[PDB]
Amino acid sequence: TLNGGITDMLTELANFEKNVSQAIHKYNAYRKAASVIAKYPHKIKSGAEAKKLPGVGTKIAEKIDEFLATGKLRKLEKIRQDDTSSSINFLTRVSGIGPSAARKFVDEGIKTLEDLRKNEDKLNHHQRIGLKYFGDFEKRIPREEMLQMQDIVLNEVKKVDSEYIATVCGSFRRGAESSGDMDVLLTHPSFTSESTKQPKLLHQVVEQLQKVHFITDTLSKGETKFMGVCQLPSKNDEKEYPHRRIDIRLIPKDQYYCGVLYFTGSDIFNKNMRAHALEKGFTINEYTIRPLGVTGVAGEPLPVDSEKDIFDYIQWKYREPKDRSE
DNA sequence: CCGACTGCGCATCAGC
DNA sequence: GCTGATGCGC
DNA sequence: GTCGG
Ligand SMILES: Nc1ncnc2c1ncn2[C@H]1C[C@H](O)[C@@H](COP(=O)(O)C(F)(F)P(=O)(O)OP(=O)(O)O)O1
Ligand SMILES: [Cl-]
Ligand SMILES: [Cl-]
Ligand SMILES: [Cl-]
Ligand SMILES: [Cl-]
Ligand SMILES: [Mg+2]
Ligand SMILES: [Mg+2]
Ligand code: NA
Ligand code: NA
Questions:
Q1: Count of alpha carbons within 13 Å of A254, Cβ hemisphere only?
Q2: Fewer Cβ atoms within 10 Å of its own Cβ: the N or the C terminal residue of chain A?
Q3: Annotated binding residue at A294?
């Protein structure tokens, strides 16, 4: 946090653009700039100096000059005082309420926590659960609890079928001392890019975790992705732990390396890495890396036997999980 | 100058 | 019902 | 909002 002030500013600007202006490219540009500045190993003394960094252009350099001179940004001060942007910004803090629904609710006079609570019937299932756990989903997860949750998830999975492999990814795999949620990558020999010889592979695991009261609510659920809410058991007399967000992704077993690469992140690291891939004539998703023909059509998946293999294809030196926190 | 900007699962909706 | 587009979040 | 060609 050499430049915590500046990165916060840009982050607030990204969120404004996404939530209020609904300008996805500006949102991503701001996030990119924040990221590159976050990792810059010097305390920035000027906008010119920041403008040397890829992703920081003229407009951002200017805002940086203002913030350095004043400790603030007029543009943001104004935004913070605009009732409508304020209302939309808060409303999108509820899981399931996006830029669109937020703006709608405001239109309809629903713009506070109290408003949402008395208008539950105007929420879809996801939003309803987001509202229910609005406070909990605010709280970070200490690594020590992530370890307990890991322990539970891995053992319960083993109980359904010893052939399942569950890997906790996200910031936890990057070594973070705290996490926003729990991301579980799941594989089983019966599900490969070649065939699905067992149905309900994801369901049985979800059901087991529900049976033991680890999973408490469901936000969405398909054949390969589950998104929901979980909770650690507390002891006699002990207050309860906050409810936590959990995501599970069932990935074909032979595409584990692309899968774990994807799910380890960070989200900006993936974006960067995928952009570079393109510039090298490849496209990467959570399943495969393929070449991009002259015509732009992606070709056949290339052989992959390690995360590193994927880095090699794009002429990047390998980066351990802990060094992918962008 | 200007096209392009990482990639995708699930929920919901519109048009047929 | 189906398919495609859009919303949301990973 | 930024950038590559
Ligand atoms: N927009 C994206 N593009 C590509 N990969 C993504 C994207 N968003 C997420 N992933 C990836 C890569 C991610 O690391 C992973 C989990 O997404 P989470 O939404 O749980 C996260 F990003 F917040 P995490 O890194 O885990 O940080 P905490 O959750 O706060 O602790 O899927
Ligand atoms: Cl935009
Ligand atoms: Cl400010
Ligand atoms: Cl793979
Ligand atoms: Cl693919
Ligand atoms: Mg996570
Ligand atoms: Mg997650
Ligand atoms: Na720059
Ligand atoms: Na939200």
A1: 10
A2: N
A3: no
Say if CB A132 and CB A216 are below 8 A apart. no
Shared domain check, A210 and A165: yes
Q: What CATH number does residue A45 fall under?
A: 1.10.150.110
**A15 and A60 inside one domain:** yes
Q: Is A104 left (phi over 0), alpha (psi -120 to 50) or beta?
A: alpha
Q: Identify the CATH number of the domain in which residue A208 sits.
A: 3.30.460.10
Q: Judge if A155 and A251 occupy the same domain.
A: yes
Resolution of this entry, Å:
2.0
| Type of residue numbered A92 | T
Q: Which atom, in ligand 1's list, is nearest to the CA of A274?
A: 4
Burial A103-136 (b: 16+ CB within 10 A, else e): bebbeeebbeeebbeeeeeebeebbbbbbbbeee
| Residue A325 alpha carbon to ligand 7 centre in Å | 15
Residues with CB under 6 A from ligand 1: A 170-171, 179-181, 183, 262-267, 270-271
Asked whether residue A171 is marked as a ligand-binding residue, the answer is yes
Where does a domain end: A222, A239, A262?
A262
3-state helix, strand, coil in chain A (%, to 5): 50, 15, 35
Of A18, A32, A63, A253, catalytic: A63
Rounded to whole angstroms, the Cα distance separating A244 from A137 reads 6
Total domains in the fold of chain A: 4
Secondary structure tally for chain A: helices H, strands E: 15, 11
**A28-34 long-range contacts, CB within 8 A, separation 24+:** A28/A271, A29/A55, A30/A60, A31/A268, A32/A268, A32/A271, A33/A60, A34/A7, A34/A10
Which residue has its alpha carbon closest to ligand 1 atom 27? A171
In Å, what is the separation between the CA of A218 and the C1' of B7?
Answer: 24
